[PDB]
Amino acid sequence: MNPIIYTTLIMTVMSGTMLVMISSHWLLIWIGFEMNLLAMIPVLMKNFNPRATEAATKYFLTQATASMMLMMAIIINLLYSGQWTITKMFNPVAMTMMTMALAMKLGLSPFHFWVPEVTQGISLQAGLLLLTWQKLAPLSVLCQISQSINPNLMLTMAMLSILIGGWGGLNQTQLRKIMAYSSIAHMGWMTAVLPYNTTMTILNLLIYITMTLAMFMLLIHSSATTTLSLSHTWNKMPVITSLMMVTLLSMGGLPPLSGFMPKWMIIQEMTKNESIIMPTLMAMTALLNLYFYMRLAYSSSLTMFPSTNNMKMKWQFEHTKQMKLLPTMIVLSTLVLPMTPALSSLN
Amino acid sequence: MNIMLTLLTNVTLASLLVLIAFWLPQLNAYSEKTSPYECGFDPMGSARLPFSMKFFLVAITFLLFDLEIALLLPLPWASQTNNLKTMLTMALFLLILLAASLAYEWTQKGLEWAE
Amino acid sequence: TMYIAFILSTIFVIGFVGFSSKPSPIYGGLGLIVSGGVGCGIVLNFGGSFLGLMVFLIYLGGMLVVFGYTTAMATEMYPEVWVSNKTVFGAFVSGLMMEFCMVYYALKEEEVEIIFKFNGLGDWVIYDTGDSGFFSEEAMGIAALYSYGTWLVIVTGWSLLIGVVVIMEITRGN
Amino acid sequence: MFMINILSLIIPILLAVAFLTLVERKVLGYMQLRKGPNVVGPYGLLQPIADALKLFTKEPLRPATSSISMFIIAPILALSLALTMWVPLPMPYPLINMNLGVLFMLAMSSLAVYSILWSGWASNSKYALIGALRAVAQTISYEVTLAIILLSVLLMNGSYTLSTLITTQEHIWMIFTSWPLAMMWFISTLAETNRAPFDLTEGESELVSGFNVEYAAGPFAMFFMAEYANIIMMNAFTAILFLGASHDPHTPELYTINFVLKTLALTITFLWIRASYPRFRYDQLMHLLWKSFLPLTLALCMWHISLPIMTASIPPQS
Amino acid sequence: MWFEILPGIAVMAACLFIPGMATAHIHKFTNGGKEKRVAHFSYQWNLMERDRCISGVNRYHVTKGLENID
Amino acid sequence: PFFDVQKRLGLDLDRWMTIQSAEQPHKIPGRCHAFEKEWIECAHGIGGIRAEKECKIEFDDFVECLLRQKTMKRLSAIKRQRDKLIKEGKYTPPPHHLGKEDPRP
Amino acid sequence: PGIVELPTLEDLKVQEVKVSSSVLKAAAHHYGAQCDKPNKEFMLCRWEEKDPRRCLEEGKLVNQCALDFFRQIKRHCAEPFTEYWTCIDYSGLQLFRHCRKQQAKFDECVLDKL
Amino acid sequence: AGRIASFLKNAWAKEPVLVASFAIGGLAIILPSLSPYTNYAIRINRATPYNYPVPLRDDGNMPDVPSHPQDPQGPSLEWLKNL
Amino acid sequence: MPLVYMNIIMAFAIALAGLLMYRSHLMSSLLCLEGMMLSLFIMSTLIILNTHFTLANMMPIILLVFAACEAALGLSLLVMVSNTYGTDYVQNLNLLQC
Numbered sequence A: 001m002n003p004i005i006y007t008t009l010i011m012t013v014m015s016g017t018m019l020v021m022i023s024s025h026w027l028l029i030w031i032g033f034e035m036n037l038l039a040m041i042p043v044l045m046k047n048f049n050p051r052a053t054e055a056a057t058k059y060f061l062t063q064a065t066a067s068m069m070l071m072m073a074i075i076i077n078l079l080y081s082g083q084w085t086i087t088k089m090f091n092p093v094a095m096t097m098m099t100m101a102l103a104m105k106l107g108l109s110p111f112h113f114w115v116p117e118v119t120q121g122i123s124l125q126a127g128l129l130l131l132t133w134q135k136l137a138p139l140s141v142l143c144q145i146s147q148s149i150n151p152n153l154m155l156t157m158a159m160l161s162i163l164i165g166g167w168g169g170l171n172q173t174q175l176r177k178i179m180a181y182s183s184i185a186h187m188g189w190m191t192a193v194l195p196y197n198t199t200m201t202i203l204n205l206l207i208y209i210t211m212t213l214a215m216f217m218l219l220i221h222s223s224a225t226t227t228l229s230l231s232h233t234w235n236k237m238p239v240i241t242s243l244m245m246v247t248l249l250s251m252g253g254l255p256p257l258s259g260f261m262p263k264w265m266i267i268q269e270m271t272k273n274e275s276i277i278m279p280t281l282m283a284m285t286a287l288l289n290l291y292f293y294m295r296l297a298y299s300s301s302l303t304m305f306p307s308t309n310n311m312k313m314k315w316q317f318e319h320t321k322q323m324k325l326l327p328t329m330i331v332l333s334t335l336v337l338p339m340t341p342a343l344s345s346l347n
Numbered sequence B: 001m002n003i004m005l006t007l008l009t010n011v012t013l014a015s016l017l018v019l020i021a022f023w024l025p026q027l028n029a030y031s032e033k034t035s036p037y038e039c040g041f042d043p044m045g046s047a048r049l050p051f052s053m054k055f056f057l058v059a060i061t062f063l064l065f066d067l068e069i070a071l072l073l074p075l076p077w078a079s080q081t082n083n084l085k086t087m088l089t090m091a092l093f094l095l096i097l098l099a100a101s102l103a104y105e106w107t108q109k110g111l112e113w114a115e
Numbered sequence C: 001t002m003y004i005a006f007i008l009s010t011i012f013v014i015g016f017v018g019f020s021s022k023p024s025p026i027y028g029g030l031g032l033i034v035s036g037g038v039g040c041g042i043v044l045n046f047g048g049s050f051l052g053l054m055v056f057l058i059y060l061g062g063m064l065v066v067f068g069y070t071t072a073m074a075t076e077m078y079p080e081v082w083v084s085n086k087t088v089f090g091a092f093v094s095g096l097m098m099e100f101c102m103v104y105y106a107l108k109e110e111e112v113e114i115i116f117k118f119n120g121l122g123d124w125v126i127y128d129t130g131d132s133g134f135f136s137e138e139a140m141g142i143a144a145l146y147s148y149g150t151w152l153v154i155v156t157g158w159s160l161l162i163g164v165v166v167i168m169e170i171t172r173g174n
Numbered sequence D: 001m002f003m004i005n006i007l008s009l010i011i012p013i014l015l016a017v018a019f020l021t022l023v024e025r026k027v028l029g030y031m032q033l034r035k036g037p038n039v040v041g042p043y044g045l046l047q048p049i050a051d052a053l054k055l056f057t058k059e060p061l062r063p064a065t066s067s068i069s070m071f072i073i074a075p076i077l078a079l080s081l082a083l084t085m086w087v088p089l090p091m092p093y094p095l096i097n098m099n100l101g102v103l104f105m106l107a108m109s110s111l112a113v114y115s116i117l118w119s120g121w122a123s124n125s126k127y128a129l130i131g132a133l134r135a136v137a138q139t140i141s142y143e144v145t146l147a148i149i150l151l152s153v154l155l156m157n158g159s160y161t162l163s164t165l166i167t168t169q170e171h172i173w174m175i176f177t178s179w180p181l182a183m184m185w186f187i188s189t190l191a192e193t194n195r196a197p198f199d200l201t202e203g204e205s206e207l208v209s210g211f212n213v214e215y216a217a218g219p220f221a222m223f224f225m226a227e228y229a230n231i232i233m234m235n236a237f238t239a240i241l242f243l244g245a246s247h248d249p250h251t252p253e254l255y256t257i258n259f260v261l262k263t264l265a266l267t268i269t270f271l272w273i274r275a276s277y278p279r280f281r282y283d284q285l286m287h288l289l290w291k292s293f294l295p296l297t298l299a300l301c302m303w304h305i306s307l308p309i310m311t312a313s314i315p316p317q318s
Numbered sequence E: 001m002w003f004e005i006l007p008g009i010a011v012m013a014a015c016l017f018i019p020g021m022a023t024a025h026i027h028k029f030t031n032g033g034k035e036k037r038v039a040h041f042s043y044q045w046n047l048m049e050r051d052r053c054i055s056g057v058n059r060y061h062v063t064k065g066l067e068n069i070d
Numbered sequence F: 001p002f003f004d005v006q007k008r009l010g011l012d013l014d015r016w017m018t019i020q021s022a023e024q025p026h027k028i029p030g031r032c033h034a035f036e037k038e039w040i041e042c043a044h045g046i047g048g049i050r051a052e053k054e055c056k057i058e059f060d061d062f063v064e065c066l067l068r069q070k071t072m073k074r075l076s077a078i079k080r081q082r083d084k085l086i087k088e089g090k091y092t093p094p095p096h097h098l099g100k101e102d103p104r105p
Numbered sequence G: 001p002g003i004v005e006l007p008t009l010e011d012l013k014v015q016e017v018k019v020s021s022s023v024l025k026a027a028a029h030h031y032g033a034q035c036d037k038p039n040k041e042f043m044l045c046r047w048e049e050k051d052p053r054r055c056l057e058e059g060k061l062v063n064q065c066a067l068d069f070f071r072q073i074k075r076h077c078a079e080p081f082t083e084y085w086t087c088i089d090y091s092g093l094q095l096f097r098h099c100r101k102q103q104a105k106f107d108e109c110v111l112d113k114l
Numbered sequence H: 001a002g003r004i005a006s007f008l009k010n011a012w013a014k015e016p017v018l019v020a021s022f023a024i025g026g027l028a029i030i031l032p033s034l035s036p037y038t039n040y041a042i043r044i045n046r047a048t049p050y051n052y053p054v055p056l057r058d059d060g061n062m063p064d065v066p067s068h069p070q071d072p073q074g075p076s077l078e079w080l081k082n083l
Numbered sequence I: 001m002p003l004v005y006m007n008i009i010m011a012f013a014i015a016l017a018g019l020l021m022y023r024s025h026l027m028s029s030l031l032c033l034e035g036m037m038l039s040l041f042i043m044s045t046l047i048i049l050n051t052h053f054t055l056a057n058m059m060p061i062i063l064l065v066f067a068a069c070e071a072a073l074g075l076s077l078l079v080m081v082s083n084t085y086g087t088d089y090v091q092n093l094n095l096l097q098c
């Protein structure tokens, strides 16, 4: 793919998301979704192979179905109110259709399978862009229509997301599938807090984006797509493994790392509204995510796996390409707990 | 109503012609008469096997250009508006983007049939 | 009344039942063409001649490409028709029975589905008494795509151009 | 009386189709230095009647491998749409007066495409399938170009009503106004009606009769009737759209005579072209429209959008 | 010779004359010897309906005038 | 989530199409222009919660104009009662409803 | 939510204008020039009151002005006007373009007599 | 200018269709901004009365609004009559 | 609501159920996906024409435009899958697992 074509497709993806986030009209929001998907498919298929083709096919099928359901919800809402502005929806059936469509777009359970499948299919850069940006847009739509969200449906899907992410990540060995299930669990947390405080939803989104960017860029730097491939990194660049270990500890929610702040604020906010069973279950279920983060950390940094003989040549050579903002992402994803009251600025 | 009556008349006349064609003449059918035609010899394969489409990309470009012409069709009514300058700018913008699509495909060799 | 709109809606649903039972893409395209023509008729009765003709023309053009693709990519030795397969016939009959049940219930009483409430009365009843004069409101509203709706034209044109670029990039291969 | 008018529109069209068959035979013969049919009747006037009787008394067969349902439907659809295309034509009064009379004809033509596709696929033979795919490609190219050309020409008119076309062409001719679009439209109608040099779906030299290779007796006659009705209808549409005739409301027969004469002239031009030129290849036809007509078509569309505005000559909406 | 083609073209022209002349004659016959009213808009249709109502015979083409107002 | 670039920059990208009481071409009025105008004017500047609590009457009238549910209920009730009455011969339609009158011009 | 109030059939009765669309279209510019005042009053009433029940008197005045206009036409220019609207009536679209002679005769008749 | 002349000579000898297409498109884009009749076309579209001209209630301080259609006040289409 | 809207919504639901229940071919799923947008077009134009929302009449055209953009995307993906595997069967898209 030509660099100019790639950069214009990335610009088109970003333009679709920005159209979604600035539009006050349901038709324009749908147009933004369509533009994002249309420009996102070739980005997935950039490195041509059957796995990438299959991942793009599954992604297209899922997103097209979600867009059809979303447009049906928009039309039904127009039928009963004659309003196009994106506000509280005036029909419960239309609202349920919209909620299920946006959940399918986000990958919330039970609409999650495509997330690990596509992430395994596509490359590391494609997976990074997918997770980050394609979580970014539908969450903005949900925040706009939050006041009419059915709390029962939203919390059911969020709790299912957390459970499914924990269990899948427990079983997996591929790094991209592990990242996909981590994304599912974090989306579950965000949408769980969504009906109460969109500010807390945005805070969780930002912290998750920072941690995911740091982790994916470390994987790109070390060129590791499996556990054993990551087990050789201590013999070439041991600093990358240490940074990955602290980032993994942060993603598990261990204090005083940055990943504790979203969980803490969400639990506080949910308890303010007399929710106790849901926060306790959500907090306890994150131990599965922490377990598979810790299992990944044992192989990479805390223990020394056997290496090979050509690692000597790899020692002799030096990394050429420089990752942009990797130190900033690594610092922001581990050492911003003392800066917690900035969520009022985020408000 | 009138258009429905016209369509019914045309369809009924065609169906009557088919019925007369299939029932008036003497019929004598056997296996050799109704076998498929391949210039006198039995076909090797089947006519339902995949038939490669060397112009598959031009078909998709045709879909997109069909959308473009659908957008352009309401131009005669849009020329009666008071915002003639905005109407002209938008019509020319759409036509220039269609021309740009054609030029991009032509230079990137999307109009060349597969070999 | 003459129930023309209701009859055409029923034929619309039947065509959808066909191509959703999915015998084979040839007959799916046939059913989709029938449904498009009947929908053109429905919206013509409701008032929109330009919209009906446009949707009919667009789907006639689109199903032409689908025929060429199913002749090439999506064909088998014995293509399936509705009576050829047990699953296809079962789905077709299930859809027909559900449509007939809904039609009968709506005609016999004001049928309120589990989702929405429907009243069995005149499509002619729901229409409006008022009239325009010496212009077509639908034609004017569609023609307002250029004076009004400059933003929609921009995003639509960008989407079409990017679609050309994308379909060229996807099929590149190598 | 409406049924009477429908019959008066249908039966003369079929008669004109049969005698167009005869006329094409004789014109091709005299251009090839022959006489053509002159034995069956006085100047061979009973030749179409003999052909029709022979075809409909001959045995029609369904191939063993064919899909009988779509094998039968295709000629029915072809003839039905061929007869239907005539209902909005003003001569000088249309049978059915439509506010959007041009888009109706476009949609019905695009539907008339599928008759040959379904007949070819249903026949279940390789020559039929090859002809069907040639039809697919041809319709792609001519359809896009036809849409844009018609858009520009009607943009010079103001609306989509053929009576308004007559009113527009009261004084001069759209051929004098916009002859380049007229040339490209004539070529596009040749491609649309599958006439030479674009007779690729039924190309006898490469395929043995093409898509209707398995059709015999009556069902073949229906395809022939549909094709010739399309030829005459497209020539009549061209005559109305570009060669406007003077209309007298109190004596409308003069418009009918002028319209018929211009339609016959264009049909004879079709036969003349068939006698004069070789046959295209279908890839060369696709590259002809997209690479030659489509750029000029877009440029002329821009020109005909701008010209009424810059000259303050925008037609009335109604 | 080339004029042996003319009878066939003459028959084809005679066949093509029938539809238009027949339509014109039927339009004048069913509309009281006048042109069939063209109602492309709601205003024209409302005018036709008013003509039907004021005619007193349920035919829009039966036109009434000063002798009918007084 | 929602970045109001349109309001910040004074642009108009889809607000012209959001509602059916806005400027329409040739000043064509909507079916429920009056009801929509009344509801919008009632609910302007008080927020969603107060708009739903206090402008409920205006919204109910707007929805009635849009969907015509109570009107169709009344019409169906009258039709059923009239059919029952003419079934037993207890009602005789007038000639002006039977088509034996001269309507107004 | 209340009872709809409708005027009785007794006060909805008025002398109708029993001419056809062609007759009305023939004497349309003169009608718009002559009975402008009652028509403009009625249109202002309709567009301000937004209620058919509140401008019935203006409608009756409009009918009275129309009848006065047509009686004036009848007493002076019955024949030129009959020829003019007979020419208009023939056309399917009721075109002003095809009757430029009878229109001239009618305008000459009303410019002198009235 | 020599390079441009050579390029146009080569294009006119190899792709006259494309040369003509681009020339016509360029004329279509540029000419309307220079023609003096664009404003006339706008005014003609404005002068068409699709809807009814609802009258204004006279407050006694509207000297520019005619009391009758034939009064000298109001828009004039004398320019359109002789055009 | 009239029965016409009920029929259109039922047709949309039938098309949605058709897409979610694959049989063998990916092309049939694309046909079901195109039918859903046809039903959406019909429903939206019926709603808009009935309420005389004049400016909304341009919405169904944009709906059609992005409909055929999706159809183009699906056809491109289908040709790539067919080139890889020989058939458009959905069973061959199984390399990636959950």
Ligand SMILES: CCCCCCCCCCCCCCCCCC(=O)OC[C@H](COP(=O)([O-])OCC[N+](C)(C)C)OC(=O)CCCCCCCCCCCCCCCCC
Pocket (backbone or CB within 6 Å): B016, B019, B020, B023, B024, B025, B026, B027
């Ligand atoms: C399905 C369409 C229905 C509407 C039709 C509308 C009119 C159609 C007009 C076109 C006609 C086309 C054919 C033209 C004539 C030439 C062919 C011909 O003669 O065909 C006739 C066919 C001819 O049979 P054939 O199959 O031997 O045809 C060969 C014909 N020749 C020799 C000329 C080539 O007749 C029959 O099939 C029936 C003959 C008598 C046997 C009757 C059996 C009982 C069923 C029918 C009678 C009614 C029973 C009622 C009670 C039922 C319950 C118990």
Ligand SMILES: CCCCCCCCCCCCCCCCC[C@@H](O)O[C@H](CO[C@H](O)CCCCCCCCCCCCCCC)COP(=O)(O)OCC[N+](C)(C)C
Pocket (backbone or CB within 6 Å): A015, B083, B085, B086, B089, B093, C147, C148, C150, C151, C154, C155, C158, F011, F012, F013, F023
């Ligand atoms: C320049 C900014 C770059 C960064 C942002 C890029 C975002 C994408 C590019 C967007 C550019 C256009 C944005 C502005 C849209 C203007 C819409 C409207 O407000 O202006 C129109 C004015 O239009 C002007 O004529 C020019 C329109 C734009 C001309 C083409 C610009 C194409 C640039 C975009 C290329 C495609 C890329 C898009 C995706 C990146 C309306 O004028 P008006 O007359 O009152 O309309 C009459 C309405 N009435 C009837 C109610 C009165």
Ligand SMILES: CCCCCCCC/C=C\CCCCCCCC(=O)O[C@H](COC(=O)CCCCCCC/C=C/CCCCCCCC)COP(=O)(O)OCCN
Pocket (backbone or CB within 6 Å): B096, B099, B100, B102, B103, B106, B107, D294, D295, D296, D298, D299, H008, H010, H011, H014, H015, H018, H019, H020, H021, H022, H023, H025, H026, H029
């Ligand atoms: C921006 C204003 C114009 C707006 C759009 C214009 C209308 C639509 C025209 C654009 C449609 C697509 C254009 C495609 C152009 C590139 C296509 C291409 O690749 O052409 C090449 C390159 O050939 C060329 O020479 C490039 C075309 C150069 C034309 C540009 C000339 C610029 C015109 C300036 C106007 C001068 C005025 C002179 C007036 C003369 C009389 C009209 C040749 O094609 P082949 O691949 O060789 O054919 C297949 C062989 N196997």
